[PDB]
Write a protein that binds this ligand. Structure first.
Ligand SMILES: *[C@@H]1O[C@H](CO)[C@@H](O[C@@H]2O[C@H](CO)[C@@H](O[C@@H]3O[C@H](CO)[C@@H](O)[C@H](O[C@H]4O[C@H](CO)[C@@H](O)[C@H](O)[C@@H]4O)[C@@H]3O)[C@H](O)[C@H]2NC(C)=O)[C@H](O)[C@H]1NC(C)=O
Ligand SMILES: *[C@@H]1O[C@H](CO)[C@@H](O[C@@H]2O[C@H](CO)[C@@H](O[C@@H]3O[C@H](CO)[C@@H](O)[C@H](O[C@H]4O[C@H](CO)[C@@H](O)[C@H](O)[C@@H]4O)[C@@H]3O)[C@H](O)[C@H]2NC(C)=O)[C@H](O)[C@H]1NC(C)=O
Ligand SMILES: *[C@@H]1O[C@H](CO)[C@@H](O[C@@H]2O[C@H](CO)[C@@H](O[C@@H]3O[C@H](CO)[C@@H](O)[C@H](O[C@H]4O[C@H](CO)[C@@H](O)[C@H](O)[C@@H]4O)[C@@H]3O)[C@H](O)[C@H]2NC(C)=O)[C@H](O)[C@H]1NC(C)=O
Ligand SMILES: CC(=O)N[C@@H]1[C@@H](O[C@@H]2O[C@H](CO)[C@H](O)[C@H](O[C@]3(C(=O)O)C[C@H](O)[C@@H](NC(C)=O)[C@H]([C@H](O)[C@H](O)CO)O3)[C@H]2O)[C@H](O)[C@@H](CO)O[C@H]1O
Ligand SMILES: CC(=O)N[C@@H]1[C@@H](O[C@@H]2O[C@H](CO)[C@H](O)[C@H](O[C@]3(C(=O)O)C[C@H](O)[C@@H](NC(C)=O)[C@H]([C@H](O)[C@H](O)CO)O3)[C@H]2O)[C@H](O)[C@@H](CO)O[C@H]1O
Ligand SMILES: CC(=O)N[C@H]1[C@H]([C@H](O)[C@H](O)CO)O[C@@](O[C@@H]2[C@@H](O)[C@H](O)O[C@H](CO)[C@@H]2O)(C(=O)O)C[C@@H]1O
Ligand SMILES: *[C@@H]1O[C@H](CO)[C@@H](O[C@@H]2O[C@H](CO)[C@@H](O)[C@H](O)[C@H]2NC(C)=O)[C@H](O)[C@H]1NC(C)=O
Ligand SMILES: *[C@@H]1O[C@H](CO)[C@@H](O[C@@H]2O[C@H](CO)[C@@H](O)[C@H](O)[C@H]2NC(C)=O)[C@H](O)[C@H]1NC(C)=O
Ligand SMILES: *[C@@H]1O[C@H](CO)[C@@H](O)[C@H](O)[C@H]1NC(C)=O
Ligand SMILES: *[C@@H]1O[C@H](CO)[C@@H](O)[C@H](O)[C@H]1NC(C)=O
Ligand SMILES: *[C@@H]1O[C@H](CO)[C@@H](O)[C@H](O)[C@H]1NC(C)=O
Ligand SMILES: *[C@@H]1O[C@H](CO)[C@@H](O)[C@H](O)[C@H]1NC(C)=O
Ligand SMILES: *[C@@H]1O[C@H](CO)[C@@H](O)[C@H](O)[C@H]1NC(C)=O
Ligand SMILES: *[C@@H]1O[C@H](CO)[C@@H](O)[C@H](O)[C@H]1NC(C)=O
Ligand SMILES: *[C@@H]1O[C@H](CO)[C@@H](O)[C@H](O)[C@H]1NC(C)=O
Ligand SMILES: *[C@@H]1O[C@H](CO)[C@@H](O)[C@H](O)[C@H]1NC(C)=O
Ligand SMILES: *[C@@H]1O[C@H](CO)[C@@H](O)[C@H](O)[C@H]1NC(C)=O
Lengths: 318, 172, 172, 318, 172, 318
């Protein structure tokens, strides 16, 4: 005689808890994770040209520490510095180390172009047992340790023009003897001086004599500085002692290069996003792996899980 | 939910329904049955899927940035580097939290709205031949076999054909 | 509001109502009366209270940070330190402004919806025994004393008992 | 014959005005305040260890300004520098003062451990009338003003090992004579020098001679520097004149310690949040008291009132 | 839309209605016509206008800030200066994207809620003298002339006057 | 008998596309633009006091480069530096150029007050061929090149009290001779020295001799430094060679003054917001012109267009 028609919706056995504006806990039939929270534990060798420092800091590679000569002229989308890297050349110190490591890392290249020295009056290629180059006493590949020649250290004055169409990165240094005897003995003048300038800049450094903790047997040190010479400009190095000469320059390019500190193994795969914990998928909007990231990556967030509802509210049945 | 259908005037869901989100359930002369409403279900699914896609296919690239871990104490400059990153992190964490909160709340109300839409679409079809019992079910006041019910679900139900029969049952 | 109940098809509010957010007021052979709907009221209060708690029990800790006031002029570095805090401040001031905006807009529709739900819950109960006069009141076409009204409010109203009496009045 | 049942909602006499997405002004039955606008004016004494500098800045306490001697070895979760603090010791200058104040504040400890320094050839415990310790001429407590002894000033060379598992914060400096006569008169050498290095760094500073505005009767000044020595490293101090010697080290630690500038009294209560304007409740999401905070605190925003609706809309009643 | 009126149970809009956002079209003994509902239309516009005004009358003054373009390479400090700006920019771009997204969704549902409000308002006026055909149309079961149709639109209609005639036509 | 009344909503021909939460592409009857994406291409001469640097950089204007003397005592809400600006005076260097350009810009005033310093024992108002103030030699208008007088150069020691109620910005510098002959020839002493101090700041610079690239014919460079003397304090300059003396000070003010780099013509109109690309309206929440802004300005965003829906969904009839 009569009929009955009922309208309804489905429900599931085990639903999913989600957060709304009126609930920090409410169950819905389905949801999806918005926070990437896991890593494979490895850095995919690509889209990004990756370069494992292995045991060389980007700086040591730049300077030319012997065991780092393998990196000569290397390039990279992402340099990876390992925590067990070490330095085994002459004791050095860089004022504003952070900045140099940064601008080089950003440049993404170590292309070095040797230029015509012009060191008249001094002895070149100085070396140290602290920087052994095989059996011999070596020094940073890209630096020229100058010393007195025939009882005299000239008042050095060399010019190097920038006739190219790109900026040149010159990195030089000054040496800090351990004693006065060393000073005069090595440079004759009792007080050295290094002045590297351009039409746009000028930095004059003065050596400082004194004893410092022995490092690979050396009490002395080398403070390292750098200079960028723009096209049309020219470099002028003027010193009468203690200069550690440049051997040329590094080409400076702009791009997406960068550096990262990570002990993650570099496997063979493909992952747009790289973190020190390894690579991670970028299909989620947020990630909780690490705030340090390189590439197309989800934003980092404190939350280890955020569920986006994808179905109606789940209402059981008694 | 703002519409009071789901978890509202409709006591509960149907775990037996596995091929749809919304559907009907009857009990006519020929016994009882159950069929999912594709139209309705798809409408919800299509909307929620778009909703989802506006949040997943999207991430921007950042390469050379600022350091975020430090091996030595430095002071002023470093403090700023950390404050900046930390400030950034809280702002996004806040954004994420608020996104799902808003989204979810809206997703629950939408699914609820789609349910109600189906109910209304049905009520209007039946016209004066049925009565809302208050639980999501309509009491059709006329012999309605499987065919008759099917016409309702497929939306071809002709109310005139049963009006008289129905009006008599309703008001007698 | 999206539902047009409060500040809509319900002209006014009842300042006389002190026991609840929603309720019924009648007139019948026995006289007038007023009672608050506990179920309805609590549903709104419970939701709004959860909504509030998502925003109050929460704050994070920050200890050592960056300086934010300066006694001397420095330049580049200080500029950055100020720009950073100022940037941070605007972003949060915006979040606060938007949160309440959103929250409040959703709170007004929710209260309105809960009012509409009660109306629908009542209409469905009464079935063919009453008619919606358009102002939130139902005209029950049958003698309905205090007890009869109470059964409606407590949701035990049996429409069959009065269907005939009602149908006569409605269609005569 | 028929009965009449009406549905309704309540309303209030005087409601509350709020802002929505469609009303910068609409009225609700009840709302709650989201912005903490008021402070007690006082700083609670404790979930946090509070230290009132009183008349001492953190630095002067660190250096050992005579009146700041009470803060000797003191600790703090939050140090409080007052606007009317002053210095009553020798005229000093600290390059990167802010960073030192910051790292010590963050360390939250003034535990000075005195070491056994070896100053052979000089006169120790130097002082001035600018830093009276009682009737006599004094100097900073954690510093050692060295001068000539028996008509000479030795090329000092002192080593001090960190054979501990924690980091040492060494704080020393160099002295700037007002005239050459003073230079030779105090250090014998016409030109002084201080070199403080580790296997990780070096800071070779050269005295500067000349007249400066009399401060407490002194033309001269003391420049101040710091050095961190990591476990397994040794400190080497090499100076033939003008060195203001360390007396030991400060033990560095990590935690939640910090520093704030405020004139707000310190009271005995219990409040998580601290602002220069006093302590404040953290039950509200936001605050408009001060952008400077410490502890569990509300995000500072510019708005002074933010109402969260907690009731339906208010519609009068005829 | 949550209410299923616009782009819902109302098949499509009228390009002909150039006097409002809402209205009626009728076919009676005297003819066929079309008015636009002012009250309704005005209510949609007033809400969207206040909604708009909140978003566009606001800008903030910022004078001396940090630099943002560099002529030379520097390092640490400059990196921080860029990250800061880049960070700030992404967060506002997100705020903007979200703002409209949210706003637009509420705007489409509000226009839907307003359409529906007019419909329920209309249905409640007609009482038992008419039926909802389900295409957004009421089949008035009595002779409702241009004067009768006007009384419905300006809200003066007295269901009692045509009640008997209608019930006769309905339940026959 | 019957009557039929249908309810409806309108629609329009050419609708508008907008984005939502459930649609990135959906059509509405009307919408408004929120992203100010265009320019006038010109900077309005008002409301903000605008000053076109022209060929002069704010710095050179401050120092007093000859072609920049029109800018003497100038003020600006917004200083505007041009891309073809050049320096036509003596080679100079400024350690921390960016911060000076900054604080000066923010003070927004070049008001210079000449002070009566008394340089006894030296020759003043010295000049250069690289400072052709008119056809003859010259120097920065606000600086005083000091040289020996009657074969000597005193240990200069001049004091200048700050008895005013405001802060004074003194800008001085030191000269770096190209050679020793030059040093001894100009300043007699073989090594110069400059010390500028207050009771609060002390800075001492040492001249550094060397050959640097010729600029307008000069290997020598001048390094520039500044010093802020607070009320109640006093300035003391002590030098026995190489000092480029101050002539007075600059009044320091706080406000909304700033600087901007552009090439945008400065017309006569009224625009609250200014950008490098020119002024732009501020009636829209966002803008995609330039992130560099000055004034009441729409927040810059990456999105070039964002439509706010202002009407219902558009559902045409066929
Ligand atoms: C200033 O003080 C510093 C720090 O105290 C001081 O430097 C020290 O110098 C001594 C010698 O001048 C160094 O002693 C060497 O120590 C290493 C151990 O690490 C040994 O290899 C050296 O070898 C000796 O003994 C070997 C026996 O197997 C022999 O084969 C070899 O020929 C040597 O006899 C030697 O003992 C010491 O390393 C440093 N210490 C530090 C902290 O750097 C310096 O001498 C002082 N300044 C001056 C020049 O007076
Ligand atoms: C380089 O210039 C500086 C600054 O001009 C200059 O320093 C000045 O030195 C004189 C002393 O030579 C200082 O004068 C003192 O001022 C205080 C004020 O509180 C007095 O108490 C001192 O009293 C002495 O002199 C009295 C004579 O009336 C005696 O009665 C008394 O016992 C004291 O011996 C004295 O007057 C002056 O304050 C400073 N100025 C500043 C701001 O430093 C310095 O002398 C010049 N350099 C050289 C080496 O010439
Ligand atoms: C250290 O090396 C630097 C770099 O080489 C060196 O500086 C150079 O000095 C020479 C002079 O010795 C400069 O030569 C000048 O070049 C410009 C070209 O624009 C001319 O104006 C000068 O003209 C002279 O010759 C003309 C010939 O007719 C005459 O008419 C006129 O009167 C002049 O006599 C002159 O030739 C050269 O420009 C600089 N190079 C740079 C880039 O700085 C410096 O001298 C060396 N150190 C020392 C002093 O040993
Ligand atoms: C040369 C030598 O073997 N002499 C023995 C003494 O040791 C020498 O001590 C001096 C310092 O007094 C240096 O450290 C010598 O080492 C080098 C180095 O670094 O390897 C030798 C290098 O040739 C030299 N390089 C140059 C270009 O100068 C380098 C530098 O001069 C210094 O680093 C300057 O800072 O020094 C070291 O061999 C030893 O003290 C003595 C006792 O047994 O025996 C001598 O035979
Ligand atoms: C007792 C007295 O008043 N003597 C007068 C002479 O004063 C001396 O002048 C010299 C400068 O030439 C210093 O200011 C002397 O002050 C001290 C000080 O600061 O207390 C003396 C300390 O013993 C000394 N301490 C050390 C470690 O050297 C200290 C330092 O040398 C300086 O502070 C370094 O800048 O100086 C002061 O007593 C005065 O020279 C003479 C002429 O006016 O008149 C004497 O009456
Ligand atoms: C104040 C003064 O003495 N001005 C000199 C100036 C300085 O002595 C010089 O800048 C110190 O670095 O030198 C001037 O130029 C000189 C030429 O006149 C001369 O032919 O060659 C000199 C090279 O050693 C030097 O270039 C200058 O800068 O104008 C002359 C000026 O009077
Ligand atoms: C990259 O590095 C190589 C070194 O490995 C450079 O090659 C040197 O080139 C110079 C001439 O410019 C020769 O005199 C050297 O003998 C080469 N080094 C040797 C022996 O291998 C090369 O010039 C650099 N160029 C790039 C790619 O930047
Ligand atoms: C990803 O790598 C980091 C290392 O950078 C892991 O280490 C955490 O580092 C933070 C420093 O911000 C510390 O507070 C935590 O104590 C560290 N976590 C632990 C328990 O080791 C980080 O945990 C890694 N995360 C993942 C997803 O593995
Ligand atoms: C939940 O939704 C996602 C996409 O919206 C879908 O891929 C997933 O299968 C759903 N959950 C399940 C397992 O049904
Ligand atoms: C609707 O149901 C009726 C009865 O079963 C059937 O005849 C008709 O073809 C159906 N319409 C469609 C196409 O689903
Ligand atoms: C409802 O009202 C009726 C009549 O007044 C009464 O008998 C019944 O017990 C009530 N039910 C409840 C649960 O209040
Ligand atoms: C609003 O006023 C009410 C009175 O019923 C009070 O209970 C409540 O605490 C106030 N709102 C809130 C949530 O603070
Ligand atoms: C703090 O100073 C005291 C003397 O008051 C000293 O004995 C103690 O070692 C110092 N702190 C420590 C424990 O390092
Ligand atoms: C409604 O229309 C009828 C007939 O046109 C008219 O008499 C009546 O006054 C109208 N009511 C109002 C207030 O518009
Ligand atoms: C309405 O809609 C169209 C498309 O958004 C738009 O371009 C037009 O500017 C809007 N109307 C106006 C002028 O506000
Ligand atoms: C510069 O301005 C000051 C007033 O601040 C004035 O005393 C001085 O004479 C002015 N110099 C010139 C060039 O007018
Ligand atoms: C605005 O100026 C910048 C340079 O500052 C230029 O690169 C950009 O393309 C210009 N864009 C506009 C809005 O015209």
């Amino acid at each position: 005689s009569t009929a009955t028609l009922c309208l309804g919706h489905h429900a599931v056995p085990n639903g999913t808890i989600v957060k709304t504006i009126t609930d920090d806990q409410i169950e819905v039939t389905n949801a999806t994770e918005l926070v990437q929270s896991s890593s494979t534990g490895k850095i995919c060798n690509n889209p990004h040209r990756i370069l494992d420092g292995r045991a060389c800091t980007l700086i040591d590679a730049l300077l030319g520490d012997p065991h780092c000569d393998v990196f000569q002229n290397e390039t990279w989308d992402l340099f990876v510095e390992r925590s067990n890297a070490f330095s085994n050349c002459y004791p050095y110190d860089i004022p504003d180390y952070a900045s140099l490591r940064s601008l080089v890392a950003s440049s993404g290249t170590l292309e070095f172009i040797t230029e015509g020295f012009t060191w008249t009056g001094v002895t070149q290629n100085g070396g140290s047992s602290a920087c052994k180059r095989g059996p011999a006493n070596g020094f940073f590949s890209r630096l020229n340790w100058l010393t007195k020649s025939e009882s005299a250290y000239p008042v050095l004055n060399v010019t190097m023009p920038n006739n190219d169409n790109f900026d040149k990165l010159y990195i030089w240094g000054v040496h800090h003897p351990s004693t006065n005897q060393e000073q005069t003995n090595l440079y004759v003048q009792a007080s050295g001086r290094v002045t590297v300038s351009t039409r746009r800049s000028q930095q004059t450094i003065i050596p400082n004599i004194g004893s410092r903790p022995w490092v690979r047997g050396q009490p002395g040190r080398i403070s390292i500085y750098w200079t960028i010479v723009k096209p049309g400009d020219v470099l002028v190095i003027n010193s009468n002692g203690n200069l550690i000469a440049p051997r040329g320059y590094f080409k400076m390019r702009t791009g997406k290069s960068s550096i990262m500190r990570s002990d993650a193994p570099i496997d063979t795969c493909i992952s747009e996003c790289i973190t020190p914990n390894g690579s991670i998928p970028n299909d989620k909007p947020f990630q909780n792996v690490n705030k340090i990231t390189y590439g197309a990556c989800p934003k980092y967030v404190k939350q280890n899980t955020l569920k986006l509802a994808t179905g109606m509210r789940n209402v059981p049945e008694k | 939910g703002l519409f009071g259908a789901i978890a509202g005037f409709i006591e509960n869901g149907w775990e037996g329904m596995i091929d749809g989100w919304y559907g009907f359930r009857h009990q006519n002369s020929e016994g009882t049955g159950q069929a999912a409403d594709l139209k309705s279900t798809q409408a919800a699914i299509d909307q929620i899927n778009r909703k989802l896609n506006r949040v997943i296919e999207k991430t921007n690239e950042k390469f050379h940035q600022i350091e975020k871990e430090f091996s030595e104490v430095e002071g002023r400059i470093q403090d700023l580097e950390k404050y900046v990153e930390d400030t950034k992190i809280d702002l996004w964490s806040y954004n994420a939290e608020l996104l799902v909160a808003l989204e979810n709340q809206h997703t629950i109300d939408l699914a609820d709205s789609e349910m109600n839409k189906l109910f209304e679409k049905t009520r209007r079809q039946l016209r004066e031949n049925a009565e809302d019992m208050g639980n999501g079910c309509f009491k059709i006041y006329h012999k309605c076999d499987n065919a008759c019910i099917e016409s309702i679900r497929n939306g071809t139900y002709d109310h005139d054909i049963y009006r008289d029969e129905a009006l008599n049952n309703r008001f007698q």
